[PDB]
């Protein structure tokens, strides 16, 4: 329960897509799910959190993300 | 919003069939889609606030609708008043 957090992925188009994820699940899972959800390809978008780029291997916990935080997505 | 009304209609229809009711589906007042990545299988939860005339009288109803996988590729789980 406290191992789960809610996260938002915000696009330049003003689209917001919301995820519930375990803290130690790699962010890759959320990225690929976001891509399939939005009809996008990974090779053409990049993710940032607090202005810094995100690795697929990174977890929410390593980035000290908290409930309700936002990841931002841009065209590559 | 269209894809969401088609869900809200289903929520109402299942409330009626699960409880022998005659609710009048109006429209979606509020809607959140949340993609749940906590399990081996991805699923999507919908959290819908829709209004429906009970006995013709306007009232506000909360609905949770479970969906296997992602939307762009169904089961009612709760339906109550506020």
From Swiss-Prot, chain A:
Q: In which tissues is it expressed?
A: Broadly expressed.
* Biological role: Ubiquitin-like protein that can be covalently attached to proteins as a monomer or as a lysine-linked polymer. Covalent attachment via an isopeptide bond to its substrates requires prior activation by the E1 complex SAE1-SAE2 and linkage to the E2 enzyme UBE2I, and can be promoted by an E3 ligase such as PIAS1-4, RANBP2, CBX4 or ZNF451. This post-translational modification on lysine residues of proteins plays a crucial role in a number of cellular processes such as nuclear transport, DNA replication and repair, mitosis and signal transduction.
Query: Where would you find this protein in the cell?
Result: Nucleus; Nucleus, PML body
Please provide the record's keywords in A-Z order.
Acetylation, Host-virus interaction, Isopeptide bond, Nucleus, Ubl conjugation, Ubl conjugation pathway
The text of the family note is: Belongs to the ubiquitin family. SUMO subfamily.
**Record's keyword annotation contains Membrane:** no
GN (gene name) = SUMO2
Q: Which GO terms describe its biological process?
A: positive regulation of proteasomal ubiquitin-dependent protein catabolic process; positive regulation of transcription by RNA polymerase II; protein sumoylation
The Ubiquitin-like domain covers 3-76
Provide a GO CC annotation, any one: presynaptic cytosol
Task: Give a short account of its post-translational modification.
Answer: Polymeric SUMO2 chains undergo 'Lys-6'-, 'Lys-11'-, 'Lys-48'- and 'Lys-63'-linked polyubiquitination by RNF4.
**Included stretch of the parent chain:** 14 to 89 of 95
Q: Which organism is it from?
A: Homo sapiens (Human)
Protein name from the UniProt record = Small ubiquitin-related modifier 2
Protein origin, superkingdom: Eukaryota
Glycyl lysine isopeptide (Lys-Gly) (interchain with G-Cter in SUMO2) crosslink location in chain: 8
Carries keyword Acetylation? yes
Oligomeric state and partners?
Answer: Interacts with SAE2 and UBE2I. Interacts with ZNF451. Identified in a complex with ZNF451 and UBE2I/UBC9, where one ZNF451 interacts with one UBE2I/UBC9 and two SUMO2 chains, one bound to the UBE2I/UBC9 active site and the other to another region of the same UBE2I/UBC9 molecule. Covalently attached to a number of proteins. Interacts with PELP1. Interacts with USP25; the interaction sumoylates USP25. Interacts with SIMC1, CASP8AP2, RNF111 and SOBP (via SIM domains). Interacts with MTA1. Interacts with HINT1. (Microbial infection) Interacts with Epstein-barr virus BGLF4.
> Mind listing the GO molecular function terms for this protein?
protein tag activity; RNA binding; SUMO transferase activity; ubiquitin protein ligase binding; ubiquitin-like protein ligase binding
């Amino acid at each position: 329960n406290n191992d789960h957090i809610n996260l938002k992925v915000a696009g330049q188009d003003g689209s917001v897509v919301q995820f519930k994820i375990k803290r130690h699940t790699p962010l890759s899972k959320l990225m690929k799910a976001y891509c399939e959800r939005q009809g996008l390809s990974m090779r053409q978008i990049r993710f940032r959190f607090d202005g810094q780029p995100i690795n697929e291997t990174d977890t929410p916990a390593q980035l000290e993300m908290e409930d309700e935080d936002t990841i931002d997505v841009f065209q590559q | 919003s269209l894809e969401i009304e088609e869900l809200a209609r289903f929520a109402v229809d299942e409330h009626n069939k699960k409880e022998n009711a005659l609710l009048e589906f109006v429209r979606v007042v509020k809607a959140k889609e949340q993609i749940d990545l906590t399990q081996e299988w991805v699923f999507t939860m919908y959290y819908l606030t829709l209004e429906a005339k009970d006995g013709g009288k306007k009232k506000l109803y909360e609905a949770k609708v479970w969906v296997k996988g992602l939307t762009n590729w169904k089961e009612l789980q709760e339906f109550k008043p506020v």
